[PDB]
Design a protein around this ligand. Structure first.
Ligand SMILES: NC(=O)c1ccc[n+]([C@@H]2O[C@H](COP(=O)([O-])OP(=O)(O)OC[C@H]3O[C@@H](n4cnc5c(N)ncnc54)[C@H](O)[C@@H]3O)[C@@H](O)[C@H]2O)c1
Ligand SMILES: NC(=O)c1ccc[n+]([C@@H]2O[C@H](COP(=O)([O-])OP(=O)(O)OC[C@H]3O[C@@H](n4cnc5c(N)ncnc54)[C@H](O)[C@@H]3O)[C@@H](O)[C@H]2O)c1
Ligand SMILES: NC(=O)c1ccc[n+]([C@@H]2O[C@H](COP(=O)([O-])OP(=O)(O)OC[C@H]3O[C@@H](n4cnc5c(N)ncnc54)[C@H](O)[C@@H]3O)[C@@H](O)[C@H]2O)c1
Ligand SMILES: NC(=O)c1ccc[n+]([C@@H]2O[C@H](COP(=O)([O-])OP(=O)(O)OC[C@H]3O[C@@H](n4cnc5c(N)ncnc54)[C@H](O)[C@@H]3O)[C@@H](O)[C@H]2O)c1
Lengths: 218, 215, 217, 215
């Protein structure tokens, strides 16, 4: 289940997520050998795995680095487009890849449940309310989009950008007599960095291809 | 559909008329403590009255081969027996709670707790200031769905019809599942869904869960 | 307190209109005027008119109030500058109470939020409001009212779900903490009761615009 | 720039305090926890988030070094308050059961709001991480005191929740909830730093954290 002294890279090493990843990975004795952010690339040694929480525009560099080092990829960057998914599919023919818009247990558990619930609550009104810290660049959140896809239809998404909220999502179902709310809260960013570590450890030694974070966890 | 109401004059009965008429259904049979009024043949009968009314209800359903949605509480063994005999001839849905949401959630929570078995779980329930019993029966039903004893916290404030919250937590995350009863209309809506389900069905007893889930 | 008022309802057939009839009749007041999208029914002269309908109805409301010199309790939301002007003109002749929210809690909170925003001036603030699926206006009047108590425009998020009578949440956030101030109308009856208080207040008053805060505080 | 001590240096709050204080360039010269005392130099101020049983040592150290005290430990008893008063004749002290801006702003607002909503029912729901030893929380007690009367407190002990408090007011027709959430424990350490900087150079006595914030 675990790997000893992995060498790893981070794309987005300087950002919020990047620094959480360094803290979590270093505590488990893993070694940072590759740093990429908007200001450059720093290659110190060959990574076994690369972790990317940055921006979609960075993904070409990320993929090239993974190909260069035959390093697996844990990708958390949100707001990916079709072009980005194609690049990942190409990469996955060479290395193991885990791409997820949310590295928590609870969102991935709920996303499955919501796919079943929506079928029984098909005639109820449904909206999503998501809340994140003030400087989050993307709205709606990737996670809101992920939950909307689990619902199997387009729903109103409301995005709050407030304080230092790590990430809350609420799915609201309503009928004339009652309401149901399904709420998830990430207590800190560390929970995503721990998910990323689980995914990294899963990937090491795997054959090439795309793996779901659900497979990582279930 | 053509439908009847036993208890048409009561709180629930007036709520049923509103909800059914809004969907374009036709009231053709009215029963209360003061009498029976047969206007046309009902496809389904809806009963929220009193256990003493059930004999007449059963008789009417047999007469018109009409299905029955039964919400009357405090039924005795004798009432259950009448109901079983009726269900040999017509389709029947009996439930002591037609909140659709609570029923849906109770199943959902039985599955969710297995996945989140190492998460801490508590219940917070809120009712109006006069509610005599704590914890509420719904909180006890939800605890039973969770398959284990959990802390239940009971707030008694103002005129709240009924809220229930199941809180799951681990070190890095929290999940809350909440249900809010806006009002008595929630049960009339449940009864509408059961009525529409029952139309055209083969005789027998159907659980409200299978109304909501297609078994 | 005024015994056996004669009153009219604009919007008598709507959700609020029916709640008004129930609340007013229970206090022994008499409905003498009914106005809806389908017509006008004048049975007797009203002392007061209660309007929870649509801004398009306001011209007829005003005309009726002028005709019978009847005061006006107005709850209709999404009023425009033209509607406010017709109201001002009306209030030269009769007493008027216009409010986007007739509950105790919201009116208590609005004062509390004016003070709280001053102390939490550097915190981010947004509003989340929730109403039933058929509500025609977004954002709600009450959200606008709350913004105005905060002394600034803020993001308002409007959910239109099921049968929710009316929820409003003001969210304040800092880097290390959040505060939410939430109000829930358990039923629509709370607004009809507010309207009744406002109607009783208005009877015998001199012409002008009166705030519902004045009605209650 | 300050020399400071921490009672509870090894705990959750203790490690947060070290991070926040060292980032502002303050120097840790005294470490106390359940396994011992480590005196490196004389502190100007001591910060104590530990256990009520540690308070005697905390007091003795502050007297020894004539150091101010910032005390966050909860579940203090009359005896602990007495020792603290005695200490405060010699040094400046800030004791608080919550070091967040939001709670100390709300407590004042709840004192006024409860007067206006005197006939509304009121309860408190508080939620903290699974390991919290004391229930109800000191903050819940503080809020109850701002409300000027005894109120039902419901305590959830779930996962890793830093600290949530909800004051629920209810009437027949409406409800009001006033909720505070501590996003991380850092917020309390930052409060403790504000308190420690306030205390420097102050006359002896007890100062409220509200005075530290000025309102
Ligand atoms: N999947 C998950 O569980 C999850 C969780 C949290 C955040 N995220 C996502 O992670 C991403 C980063 O979030 P954050 O809060 O750390 O943002 P951030 O702004 O703090 O960090 C961005 C990092 O990316 C770098 N960067 C930005 N654009 C770049 C470019 N075009 N080329 C190279 N480097 C670039 C920055 O220099 C910085 O190091 C976002 O897309 C966010 O939504 C995903
Ligand atoms: N299952 C649910 O979802 C649900 C929810 C709420 C209430 N209930 C139940 O519904 C029933 C009705 O509740 P309610 O609040 O409408 O009460 P109610 O007192 O307002 O109405 C009672 C109705 O029953 C009629 N009735 C009583 N005895 C009768 C008799 N023997 N013969 C014919 N009619 C008779 C009355 O005439 C009246 O119309 C109760 O048993 C209650 O427990 C069920
Ligand atoms: N101020 C408050 O405390 C408060 C509280 C609740 C609702 N409201 C407001 O009350 C108003 C109506 O709410 P509702 O839920 O009752 O609406 P509704 O749709 O249920 O009823 C609308 C009523 O207005 C009538 N109407 C519509 N257009 C008309 C016209 N051109 N001329 C005459 N009558 C017309 C309809 O026939 C109906 O009787 C809205 O503006 C709503 O936002 C205010
Ligand atoms: N006032 C506030 O703003 C606030 C905020 C958070 C926590 N707290 C309180 O702070 C205290 C500590 O919380 P925590 O979560 O960091 O607890 P913790 O369990 O992580 O740490 C307790 C610390 O105190 C030490 N300790 C215990 N008994 C001792 C003794 N007899 N002598 C010397 N040291 C002893 C431990 O070694 C440890 O260093 C609690 O009382 C908690 O309620 C207060």
């Amino acid at each position: 289940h675990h790997h000893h002294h992995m060498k790893y890279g981070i794309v987005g090493y300087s950002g919020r997520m990047g620094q959480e990843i360094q803290k979590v990975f270093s505590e488990k004795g893993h070694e940072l050998v590759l740093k990429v952010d908007v200001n450059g690339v720093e290659e110190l040694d060959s990574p076994d795995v690369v972790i990317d929480f940055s921006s979609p525009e960075a993904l070409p560099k990320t993929v090239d680095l993974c190909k260069k080092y035959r390093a697996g990829l844990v990708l958390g960057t949100t707001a990916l487009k079709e072009e980005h998914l194609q690049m990942l599919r190409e990469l996955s023919k060479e290395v193991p890849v885990v791409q997820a818009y949310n590295f928590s247990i609870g969102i991935n558990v709920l996303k499955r449940f919501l796919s079943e619930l929506v079928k029984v609550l098909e005639d109820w009104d449904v909206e999503i309310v998501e809340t994140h810290h003030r400087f989050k660049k993307d709205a709606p959140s990737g996670t809101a989009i992920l939950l909307e896809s689990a619902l199997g239809k387009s729903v109103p998404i409301h995005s709050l950008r407030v304080g230092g909220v790590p990430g809350d999502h609420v799915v609201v179902f309503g009928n004339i007599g009652e309401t149901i709310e399904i709420k998830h809260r990430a207590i800190s960013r560390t929970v995503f960095a721990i998910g990323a570590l689980k995914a990294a450890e899963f990937l090491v030694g795997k054959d090439p291809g795309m793996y779901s974070f659900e497979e990582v966890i279930f």
